Amino acid sequence: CLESGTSCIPGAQHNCCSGVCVPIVTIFYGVCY
Numbered sequence: 001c002l003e004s005g006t007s008c009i010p011g012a013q014h015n016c017c018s019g020v021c022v023p024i025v026t027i028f029y030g031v032c033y
Contacts, residue, residue, distance in 0.1 A: 002015055002017065002032045003032060004016075004018070004031075004033060005031055006032050007030065008022045008032045009028065014032065016032030018033040019023065020026070020032065
């Protein structure tokens, strides 16, 4: 799973450990909760 702080893409298949992808710059660049 993508760990906390690791970049994910909000709207795409975000396999984060919490599952939550937090948009930082935009919805094109976020980080997992």
